[PDB]
Amino acid sequence: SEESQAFQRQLTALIGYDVTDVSNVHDDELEFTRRGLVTPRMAEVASRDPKLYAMHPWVTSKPLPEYLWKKIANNCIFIVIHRSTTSQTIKVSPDDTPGAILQSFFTKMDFVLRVCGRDEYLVGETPIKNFQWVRHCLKNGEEIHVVLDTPPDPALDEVRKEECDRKFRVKIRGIDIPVLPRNTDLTVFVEANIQHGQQVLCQRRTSPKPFTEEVLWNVWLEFSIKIKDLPKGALLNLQIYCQLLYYVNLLLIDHRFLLRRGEYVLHMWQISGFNADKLTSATNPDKENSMSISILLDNRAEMPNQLRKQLEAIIATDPLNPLTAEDKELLWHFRYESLKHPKAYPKLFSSVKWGQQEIVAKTYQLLARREVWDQSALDVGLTMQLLDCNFSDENVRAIAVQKLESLEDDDVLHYLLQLVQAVKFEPYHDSALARFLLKRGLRNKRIGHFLFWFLRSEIAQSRHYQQRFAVILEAYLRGCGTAMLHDFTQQVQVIEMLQKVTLDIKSLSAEKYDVSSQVISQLKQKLENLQNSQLPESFRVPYDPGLKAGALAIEKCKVMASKKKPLWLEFKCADPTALSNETIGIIFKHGDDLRQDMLILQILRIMESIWETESLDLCLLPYGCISTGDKIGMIEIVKDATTIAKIQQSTVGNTGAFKDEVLNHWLKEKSPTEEKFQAAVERFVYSCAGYCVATFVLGIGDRHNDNIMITETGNLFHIDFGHILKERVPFVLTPDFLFVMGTSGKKTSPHFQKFQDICVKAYLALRHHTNLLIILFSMMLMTGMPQLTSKEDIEYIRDALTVGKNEEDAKKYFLDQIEVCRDKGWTVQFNWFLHLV
Ligand SMILES: Cc1cc([C@@H](C)Nc2ccccc2C(=O)O)c2nc(N3CCOCC3)cc(=O)n2c1
C-alpha cells in the first residue's frame, strides 16, 4: 500500500539510513534478517500488558542499602499528593503498594499516581521503597511529590501491523584501486586468512606483484583446511600489505548454513591510525574511492591431585591471562571437570579447535549437558566474556544470551550500551543477542528509548556497522507504538535543528579565545528564528526521557570562550505541574567523539551499582550524554556547577600560583548557612574519593584541572572524556582539595583519614568484580577507543586492579598512589599550562 510507502520513509528519516537499499550488499542477509525479526518483535508486541507498558514504571528488586535506610530511621515515608491547588502529605509505610496508598488518600478525604514535572508513573504491584524515583528523592533529600490524574491511553500505543572432503580453495583474481598517488611506489601481496573469532585457522599469501591501479594474480590459494572442517562463522579475511592497507571479510558459511560460491567483487576498508571494525562482514559502500578485490569460489575415571590443582589454577586467573598450548590441551582432555565450573567456560571454549568438525561435534555434546551452567547464579562478567570478539560460535554465544534473559529491566538499562556494542562481535546479522535487545526494547519503554539512541549513535557514524544496526532499529521502530514513533520524530527534528546551529557558530569563529559581539548577536537571532515556528512546543529530553522541554531561555544560552565553541543551551520545563522553575540545560559539542564519553559514563554507573552492593555511596555524577552523529552530540548540564580552573582563576587569574584556600572559601561563599557548608564538605569527601578510584581503574586519572568540576553543594566531578581518549600522576589530587580535607602539606586531618578510608574501601569493592571490570574495559576499547587498542593497551586494567595480589598488597598499592599526587603537588598541573597556554 501507498501508506506503507510513506511509513517506511518515516522509518528511514527516523533511522538515518535506508534499510531497503541493496546497492552495498552481495547477498540477502539484511533482508532475510528484516524478515526474521518479525517473529520475535510480534512475540513481544502481541504479549505485553498495555497498561504497564504505557506507564513504563521504573522498579528494582535489589535490597534498599544501609545508607538509604539511615534516611528513614523512623520506618515512615512522606508522600505529597496533588490534584489542582490542594496538596496533603501521607504517612506511608516503605512496603506500601501504589494501590494501598491510593485508598489511604480516598479514606483521608480510577486515577493514577504521576510524578510532578516528569512523565513518570508510580504504578504496579511493587512497594514504594522499590521505586527508582522514590530512592532518588531519599538520596538527594527531596520530598516525593505526585499528581492525581487519569492513566495514559494504551490505544495511543497501537502498532501498525505488517505482513565434501577436499581442501578449501580461493582464487584471487586481482585488486583494483581507481586512484593511488599519495605515497612512493612499492610491491604488494594479498593475505587470505581463515578465522573463527580473532583466531586464524590457516593463512595463505600471494606472490608479491608490483603495486598498480589493477594487480592481477589469477592464483588459486589452497588452504590446509578441508570443507567439512570449516565452522559456521568462519570468516575469510582478505588483507593487503605493501604494513597493512586494506581489509575485507566474507562469511564462508552463509546465514542459510551454505558454503559461499561464485564471483565476488568486494570493496575494502582502509587503515588510518585489536579493533571491532576490523571484523565486519559489511563491504565499503564508497565504491568510487575504495580498493576492491576480485575472488572466485567453486567448492568414567576422574582426575589426579596435581592436575585438578593445575586446572583449578587456570580457572582462577583473570580473563586477560593468556593460555599456553599446555593449558588448552589440559582444559580439553578434562572437558567434564571443566564443565562442572561455570568460571571455566570462557577458558574451556578458547581451548576448542573450531577448524575440526569432530571437535566441534564433541563441543556440541558438552553443551547438551548445560545442567551446571543453567542452574548456576548469573555472572554478568562471565556472560559478557562469552559474547566478545574471541567467541564466534552461535551455540556458545546462545548460552550467554540464555543467562541474560533472567535480568530485570533495571540491569538491562545498566548494561545496554555494552550489550548494544557487543552486536559488533556477532558473525551474522540475526543473533540471539540482537533478538534479546529487541525483546527487552519492546517489553519496556525506557530500554526502548535508550536502545533507539544507542543504535542511532552508531548508524550515523559507522560505515562498518550502520547497515546491521539499522535492521535492528527498524525491528524496534516497527513495534514501539505510534506514541514513541511520534516522540522520536520530534526529538530527532530538534537535535538536527540544534546541531545545525552548533556547526554554524563553530564556523563563524576563529580558534582563539574571543566571544566577540558578532558571534553573540548571531547566536541570539539564530535561536530566536528557531524559537518562533521551527522547534515544537515540547520535545523529550534524550538523555532523560522522564523530562519534557519547552522554550529556550535565550538570555541564559551561551557559547564557550575556548576553541571548541560548544553551545550552552537552557530550556524551560514543558510540564506546568513541575515542583520548581528549574531549567533543562543541554551542551551541544562538535570536535570530540562523544561515544567515548558515553562508555566511560556507563562504566561510572556500573561502579556506583557495585559500590551499592557493599553499601557505599560515592556521590558520582554520571551526567547524561548521547552521541548523535560524527564528532557531535548532547551533554546534560549539572545545575549550578563550575570548573576547578574557574574557581582558581577568580581570586588569582591565568597563573599557576594555585592558592589552596580559594576552594574552601568558594564552598563557604556559595553556602546560605553553616550546615549547608557541613553537608558540602560531606558531599566533597565521597565525590573526590569516588572519582579518584574510578579514574585510576579506567586509566583516565592524569587530567587538567579545567576538565574537573564541582557544585555549590560540594559534589566534585570529572568531565570531557572524549578529548583525552614524561612526568605523570596516577589521578587528580592537589593541595586545593587537600585543604578542604584539612591538610597543610603534611597532616592527617579527620576528613583526609575519612577519604583514605573510603578510597581503599571502594577500590577493594571494585576488586570483588575484577573479571567484570576487565571485560567491560577490554570491550570498551575494542568498540569505542581506536588509538587505545593493542594487547598492551587492554592489559592496563590488570595492573591497576592489582590482579593476583591479596587485600593487604592492594591496600598498600592504592595509598602509595595518593602519595605520588602529594610528592608532585602541582608539577604536572603547571605542565598543562605550557601545552594548553
Ligand atoms: C569542553 C567542555 C566544556 C564544558 C563546560 C564546562 N564549558 C562550557 C560549555 C559550553 C558553554 C560554555 C562553557 C563555559 O566554558 O562556560 C563541559 N561541560 C560539561 N558538563 C558536564 C555536566 O555539567 C555541566 C557541564 C561536560 C563536558 O564534557 N564539557 C566539555
Side-chain angles (χ1 to χ4, degrees):
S1 60
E2 179 56 74
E3 261 296 280
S4 300
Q5 306 283 94
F7 180 61
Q8 182 63 58
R9 281 189 289 244
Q10 196 185 105
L11 296 172
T12 304
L14 269 165
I15 298 158
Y17 181 86
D18 211 309
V19 289
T20 49
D21 161 79
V22 302
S23 67
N24 190 58
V25 292
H26 59 245
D27 84 293
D28 77 311
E29 208 182 358
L30 293 168
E31 199 62 41
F32 175 67
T33 306
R34 266 178 41 111
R35 292 198 268 98
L37 295 171
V38 175
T39 315
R41 177 196 310 164
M42 290 170 187
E44 208 73 45
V45 172
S47 180
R48 58 161 179 246
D49 184 282
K51 286 126 186 75
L52 285 139
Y53 176 70
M55 263 159 271
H56 54 262
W58 194 10
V59 293
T60 177
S61 58
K62 294 174 202 77
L64 188 79
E66 191 172 46
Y67 56 89
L68 283 180
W69 257 126
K70 201 95 173 186
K71 273 264 162 280
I72 303 296
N74 60 316
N75 204 90
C76 191
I77 292 159
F78 295 91
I79 296 147
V80 195
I81 303 168
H82 307 246
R83 181 61 186 93
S84 302
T85 321
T86 40
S87 61
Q88 92 146 54
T89 322
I90 326 290
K91 299 181 98 85
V92 164
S93 166
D95 318 294
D96 287 347
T97 47
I101 303 143
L102 185 97
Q103 70 164 100
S104 177
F105 178 82
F106 188 86
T107 308
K108 284 182 186 288
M109 299 156 282
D110 301 290
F111 293 94
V112 135
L113 299 127
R114 204 260 288 164
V115 183
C116 299
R118 294 189 163 267
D119 196 85
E120 198 59 71
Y121 304 87
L122 259 58
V123 291
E125 298 312 307
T126 325
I128 50 98
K129 76 140 195 162
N130 283 357
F131 276 85
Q132 295 279 74
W133 183 251
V134 176
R135 285 194 194 194
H136 162 78
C137 304
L138 291 154
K139 202 199 130 165
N140 269 216
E142 288 167 70
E143 336 113 81
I144 305 110
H145 291 268
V146 287
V147 187
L148 196 124
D149 50 326
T150 55
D153 191 33
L156 310 159
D157 305 3
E158 61 166 54
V159 177
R160 185 178 173 154
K161 306 262 179 176
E162 199 71 19
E163 207 277 337
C164 63
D165 211 60
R166 60 203 184 111
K167 269 170 282 298
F168 175 86
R169 235 181 168 171
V170 69
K171 176 183 244 167
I172 308 305
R173 296 209 168 278
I175 54 108
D176 31 356
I177 182 89
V179 53
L180 61 100
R182 266 172 205 165
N183 206 58
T184 185
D185 62 349
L186 210 93
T187 185
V188 89
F189 71 92
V190 171
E191 195 193 274
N193 305 286
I194 295 173
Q195 47 181 94
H196 186 271
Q198 303 262 228
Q199 53 190 284
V200 293
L201 304 175
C202 38
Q203 181 193 85
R204 283 293 183 274
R205 281 166 168 186
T206 60
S207 57
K209 268 168 187 166
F211 193 87
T212 53
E213 291 95 48
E214 187 198 41
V215 196
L216 289 138
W217 264 279
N218 220 257
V219 288
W220 263 115
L221 284 170
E222 208 180 296
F223 284 90
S224 57
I225 196 151
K226 292 182 179 290
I227 281 133
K228 50 156 207 186
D229 297 309
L230 274 189
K232 210 217 180 191
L235 195 78
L236 174 70
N237 176 231
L238 304 154
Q239 287 181 149
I240 283 169
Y241 302 87
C242 60
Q243 37 180 74
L244 189 72
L245 304 159
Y246 305 97
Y247 68 91
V248 89
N249 307 299
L250 186 84
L251 278 160
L252 296 178
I253 317 300
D254 83 9
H255 44 94
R256 272 145 181 166
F257 299 66
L258 303 176
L259 195 125
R260 210 131 235 140
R261 254 198 168 194
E263 294 272 356
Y264 287 91
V265 193
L266 307 162
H267 284 79
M268 314 170 86
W269 307 93
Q270 215 209 296
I271 300 288
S272 72
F274 219 105
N275 201 295
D277 295 332
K278 279 219 208 78
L279 304 166
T280 195
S281 67
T283 49
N284 194 337
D286 172 28
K287 290 168 192 72
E288 205 205 358
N289 303 262
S290 61
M291 157 78 78
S292 99
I293 188 161
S294 296
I295 67 113
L296 164 72
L297 292 164
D298 201 287
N299 306 266
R300 226 205 66 88
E302 225 166 77
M303 270 223 263
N305 184 74
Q306 232 63 31
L307 290 188
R308 207 176 178 89
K309 287 158 146 77
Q310 201 167 305
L311 201 113
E312 277 170 70
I314 284 152
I315 314 156
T317 59
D318 65 294
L320 279 170
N321 176 77
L323 295 180
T324 65
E326 207 271 331
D327 301 327
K328 294 189 191 208
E329 278 170 349
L330 190 72
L331 266 327
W332 186 252
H333 195 60
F334 307 103
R335 277 157 240 170
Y336 303 93
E337 198 49 67
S338 294
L339 213 71
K340 286 204 263 282
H341 295 258
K343 280 185 190 161
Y345 283 52
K347 303 187 168 287
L348 165 72
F349 298 122
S350 299
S351 312
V352 178
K353 277 171 162 192
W354 298 98
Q356 269 216 53
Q357 175 91 282
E358 195 165 286
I359 289 301
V360 182
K362 291 191 204 285
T363 307
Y364 285 13
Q365 276 295 292
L366 279 138
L367 295 167
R369 291 212 172 196
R370 253 194 284 119
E371 281 173 35
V372 201
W373 174 267
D374 299 0
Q375 279 195 289
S376 79
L378 157 69
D379 191 294
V380 185
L382 205 78
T383 304
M384 291 285 266
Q385 224 154 139
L386 293 161
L387 284 189
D388 70 31
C389 68
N390 312 281
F391 304 95
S392 298
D393 196 73
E394 59 173 36
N395 309 298
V396 167
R397 296 178 69 96
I399 79 176
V401 179
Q402 157 203 50
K403 222 69 204 156
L404 281 172
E405 291 280 6
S406 69
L407 301 158
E408 47 164 30
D409 296 312
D410 205 62
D411 286 305
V412 178
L413 288 151
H414 247 80
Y415 300 110
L416 194 63
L417 185 67
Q418 305 271 47
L419 300 171
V420 172
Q421 296 291 317
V423 163
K424 288 172 161 176
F425 309 118
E426 284 293 338
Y428 301 102
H429 299 302
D430 198 355
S431 47
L433 181 68
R435 283 174 184 244
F436 171 81
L437 292 168
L438 177 59
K439 275 187 253 191
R440 308 303 298 259
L442 298 166
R443 194 176 300 178
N444 192 306
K445 293 191 175 208
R446 208 177 156 87
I447 297 166
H449 170 87
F450 290 119
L451 190 66
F452 176 93
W453 293 93
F454 294 170
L455 300 168
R456 235 212 183 237
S457 77
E458 298 295 345
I459 280 154
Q461 214 163 352
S462 198
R463 277 138 178 176
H464 294 85
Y465 291 97
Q466 85 223 138
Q467 331 194 273
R468 169 190 288 193
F469 284 146
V471 155
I472 308 152
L473 190 44
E474 181 182 38
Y476 169 73
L477 283 167
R478 285 189 167 270
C480 65
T482 340
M484 294 199 87
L485 283 152
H486 168 262
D487 249 328
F488 299 125
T489 308
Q490 290 262 119
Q491 298 175 51
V492 167
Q493 279 183 43
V494 174
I495 319 307
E496 286 179 346
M497 275 180 243
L498 303 158
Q499 284 172 110
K500 277 189 261 177
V501 190
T502 305
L503 305 161
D504 297 340
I505 265 84
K506 184 110 164 175
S507 292
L508 286 149
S509 56
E511 221 220 300
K512 296 270 176 77
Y513 182 108
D514 68 274
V515 198
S516 61
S517 184
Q518 213 149 35
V519 206
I520 329 155
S521 194
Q522 178 71 67
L523 194 261
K524 274 272 172 174
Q525 210 199 80
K526 258 256 156 65
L527 294 165
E528 267 169 41
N529 297 149
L530 304 177
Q531 179 83 285
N532 294 285
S533 199
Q534 303 287 286
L535 64 107
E537 293 86 346
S538 91
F539 69 92
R540 183 139 285 150
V541 167
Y543 60 77
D544 188 337
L547 297 167
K548 261 269 191 183
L552 283 140
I554 311 112
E555 45 270 79
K556 309 187 192 176
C557 309
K558 66 184 136 158
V559 178
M560 201 168 80
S562 305
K563 72 153 185 181
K564 300 266 164 64
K565 270 93 186 179
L567 307 176
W568 177 291
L569 298 163
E570 269 178 68
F571 294 88
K572 65 156 192 173
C573 172
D575 205 321
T577 75
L579 174 63
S580 289
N581 290 286
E582 278 274 282
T583 51
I584 293 152
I586 326 179
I587 285 163
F588 272 92
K589 176 193 75 185
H590 173 82
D592 300 313
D593 181 7
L594 286 172
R595 274 190 290 172
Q596 306 188 135
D597 288 59
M598 291 195 306
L599 282 171
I600 300 282
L601 297 161
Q602 208 40 244
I603 295 199
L604 251 52
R605 279 156 178 119
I606 283 157
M607 284 177 186
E608 269 202 304
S609 245
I610 298 173
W611 290 326
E612 192 193 6
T613 83
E614 290 168 70
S615 278
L616 300 175
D617 185 339
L618 285 87
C619 286
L620 306 199
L621 283 158
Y623 52 86
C625 181
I626 304 304
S627 189
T628 55
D630 166 50
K631 262 96 186 179
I632 197 153
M634 318 156 60
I635 297 159
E636 157 159 52
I637 284 160
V638 173
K639 283 306 175 74
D640 58 68
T642 46
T643 45
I644 283 291
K646 198 169 267 183
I647 296 144
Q648 299 300 103
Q649 282 176 291
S650 62
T651 306
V652 204
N654 205 263
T655 31
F658 301 111
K659 293 167 182 172
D660 326 326
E661 289 71 59
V662 192
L663 198 61
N664 197 281
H665 280 288
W666 192 88
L667 283 140
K668 205 180 184 73
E669 188 226 308
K670 292 290 169 210
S671 66
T673 71
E674 220 299 304
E675 213 296 316
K676 284 146 195 177
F677 170 79
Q678 287 292 95
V681 291
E682 173 90 299
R683 213 91 190 170
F684 190 86
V685 173
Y686 304 125
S687 68
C688 187
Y691 279 101
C692 278
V693 175
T695 50
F696 174 72
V697 164
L698 288 158
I700 54 119
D702 175 30
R703 309 281 273 100
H704 178 218
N705 58 82
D706 195 52
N707 305 138
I708 303 110
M709 297 189 62
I710 172 146
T711 64
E712 286 183 14
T713 55
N715 206 317
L716 181 94
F717 64 102
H718 263 232
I719 61 151
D720 201 13
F721 311 96
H723 87 295
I724 46 106
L725 290 151
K726 265 207 262 78
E727 213 200 331
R728 54 190 72 180
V729 283
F731 51 88
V732 169
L733 183 75
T734 63
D736 67 320
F737 316 111
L738 289 153
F739 174 75
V740 184
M741 293 178 191
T743 288
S744 304
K746 304 271 172 286
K747 268 178 193 282
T748 322
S749 45
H751 277 102
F752 172 70
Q753 290 176 162
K754 201 173 174 181
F755 165 89
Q756 276 184 302
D757 179 64
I758 294 152
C759 289
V760 188
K761 278 171 167 178
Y763 179 50
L764 285 159
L766 296 183
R767 283 178 96 257
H768 289 102
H769 293 256
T770 289
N771 291 35
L772 171 71
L773 304 185
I774 296 203
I775 288 312
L776 298 168
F777 187 84
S778 179
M779 259 178 180
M780 163 177 85
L781 302 179
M782 299 182 300
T783 66
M785 321 285 172
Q787 301 232 295
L788 302 312
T789 35
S790 65
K791 290 166 183 178
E792 54 210 33
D793 277 309
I794 301 151
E795 276 207 59
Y796 170 82
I797 204 125
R798 305 175 70 157
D799 310 308
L801 277 173
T802 197
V803 151
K805 321 296 163 182
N806 47 86
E807 289 175 284
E808 208 184 78
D809 283 334
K811 190 177 204 81
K812 290 173 170 79
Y813 176 74
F814 196 69
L815 293 155
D816 280 349
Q817 302 307 318
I818 286 164
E819 296 308 301
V820 188
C821 296
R822 278 176 63 185
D823 307 328
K824 265 74 167 65
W826 298 102
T827 52
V828 197
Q829 288 299 323
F830 156 75
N831 269 282
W832 295 124
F833 200 92
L834 266 156
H835 193 90
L836 187 99
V837 189

